[PDB]
């Protein structure tokens, strides 16, 4: 399972492998993205989760000090300016200078060598959102020689918006195909121009596509919960309903809203007037 | 198939609003009220049961899952837990304090 977390209007993917920072940035560039950026303390947690679930696949196979390439490098030319929170570095995907940092040990005042930054992680200790991964500069490396403890990288993608996960009212499996070739079945948010192949049963095959229903509005096009089986009704996952699940017949149902709320066109999600 | 959604051509909701729930019609359009105890439900132009209800039977009636009397915070025995909820949402609609389910059986 490919490690991916999509939050807000951006996504984060973590891939293992000994690639130099030039090959890693080129890999993220192929899928229309760039190496991850730890601009805010919130992005730190998001990038720390895609790594956490990547290591959880093979933590014993990765060194106890793991380095994961991110999109921060200071090309050769001028020395770091300590006063800057980013230490004179620049995000590989462009942008401005962020006030958040997490440097470890001490940076080398080499104004003649280009140096890339990876995220260091101590895998002997449990991973926690409080003990956020520390930053480590060093040689960017070459093809075949990525560097010491380099065992992966993190690509960050950006989109105009995100859809919501398809709510199922019965037994089924949905496979969300993101724009980048990563396809997952457990996406907390689905980006624009993504395909979802619902496999209703335990066998119907439904397909939907994240489309701009309106400015800053993204919808698949489905109405009501999917995979609904009369054998279960509201017993199974509350019929995939936002809050209330009205009963009717033997297995028929329809999502309901508590007084004051209002059901939307999705026939599932509730929203209050005020 | 069914006719297109016509908001203006929707029967205006109760002036106090549906005090149980809220949903669309059978065709998936317009607002509708959740059917209370002993209300038609099931198969075009149908309504669906409230929470804690079952549509015992084409179309039947909504009976409470809790078919046993209960004792509430109002110091009054109710016919069922469903009637305690139905009268409780009225209290908040008219500003009165919410009627809570204190115990079951009768009110000592």
UniProtKB/Swiss-Prot annotation, chain A:
Disulfide pairings: 116-140, 234-245, 241-255, 257-270
PTM statement from Swiss-Prot or TrEMBL: N- and O-glycosylated.
Source organism superkingdom: Eukaryota
Record's subcellular location: Cell membrane
Domain named EGF-like: residues: 230-271
Residue ranges constituting the C-type lectin domain according to the UniProt record: 7-149
Outcome (variant: residue 79 to S): Loss of interaction with MMRN2
Organ and tissue specificity: Highly expressed in endothelial cells, platelets, cells of myeloid origin, such as monocytes and neutrophils. Not expressed in cells of lymphoid origin.
Function per UniProt: Cell surface receptor that plays a role in various physiological processes including inflammation, phagocytosis, and cell adhesion. Plays a role in phagocytosis and enhances the uptake of apoptotic cells and immune complexes by acting as a receptor for defense collagens including surfactant protein A/SFTPA1, C1q, and mannose-binding lectin (MBL2). Plays a role in the regulation of endothelial cell function and adhesion by activating angiogenesis.
Complex and partners: Homodimer. Interacts with C1QBP; the association may represent a cell surface C1q receptor. Interacts with surfactant protein A/SFTPA1. Interacts with multimerin-2/MMRN2. Interacts with DAG1; this interaction plays an important role in endothelial cell migration. Interacts with CBL. Interacts with IGFBP7. Interacts with VEGFR2. (Microbial infection) Interacts with hepatitis virus C/HCV core protein.
Stated name of the protein: Complement component C1q receptor
Organism the protein comes from: Homo sapiens (Human)
Gene: CD93
From Swiss-Prot, chain B:
Protein name, UniProt field: Insulin-like growth factor-binding protein 7
Complexes and interactors: May interact with VPS24/CHMP3; the relevance of such interaction however remains unclear. Interacts with CD93; this interaction plays a role in endothelial cells angiogenesis.
Cysteine disulfide partners in this protein: 2-27, 5-29, 10-30, 18-33, 41-55, 49-62, 71-107
Record domain Kazal-like: where: 58-108
Location of the protein in the cell: Secreted
Illness the protein is tied to: Retinal arterial macroaneurysm with supravalvular pulmonic stenosis: An autosomal recessive condition characterized by the bilateral appearance of 'beading' along the major retinal arterial trunks, with the subsequent formation of macroaneurysms. Affected individuals also have supravalvular pulmonic stenosis, often requiring surgical correction.
Protein task: Binds IGF1 and IGF2 with a relatively low affinity. Stimulates prostacyclin (PGI2) production. Stimulates cell adhesion. Acts as a ligand for CD93 to play a role in angiogenesis.
Post-translational events: N-glycosylated.
Location of the IGFBP N-terminal domain: 1-65
Superkingdom of the organism of origin: Eukaryota
Coiled coil: none
């Amino acid at each position: 399972t490919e490690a991916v977390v999509c939050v807000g209007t951006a996504c984060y993917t973590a891939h293992s492998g000994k690639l130099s920072a030039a090959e890693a940035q080129n890999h993220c560039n192929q899928n229309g993205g760039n190496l991850a950026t730890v601009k805010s303390k919130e992005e730190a947690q998001h990038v720390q989760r895609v790594l956490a679930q990547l290591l959880r696949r093979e933590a014993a196979l990765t060194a106890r000090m793991s380095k994961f390439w991110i999109g921060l490098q200071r090309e050769k030319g001028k020395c770091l300016d300590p006063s800057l929170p980013l230490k004179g570095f620049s995000w590989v995907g462009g942008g401005e200078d962020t006030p958040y940092s997490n440097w470890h040990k001490e940076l080398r005042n080499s104004c003649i060598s280009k140096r890339c930054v990876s995220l260091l992680l101590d895998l002997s200790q449990p991973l926690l959102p409080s003990r956020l991964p520390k930053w480590s500069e060093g040689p960017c490396g070459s093809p075949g020689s990525p560097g010491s403890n380099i065992e992966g990288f993190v690509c960050k993608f950006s989109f105009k918006g995100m859809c919501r996960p398809l709510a199922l009212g019965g037994p089924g499996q949905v496979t969300y195909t993101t724009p980048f070739q990563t396809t997952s079945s457990s996406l907390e948010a689905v980006p624009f121009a993504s395909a979802a192949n619902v496999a209703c049963g335990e066998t119907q095959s439904h397909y939907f596509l994240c489309k701009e229903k309106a400015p800053d509005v993204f919808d698949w096009g489905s109405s009501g919960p999917l995979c609904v089986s009369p054998k279960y009704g509201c017993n199974f996952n509350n019929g995939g309903c936002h809050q209330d699940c009205f009963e009717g017949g033997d297995g028929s149902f329809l999502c309901g809203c508590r007084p004051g709320f209002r059901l939307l066109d999705d026939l599932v999600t509730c929203a209050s007037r005020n």
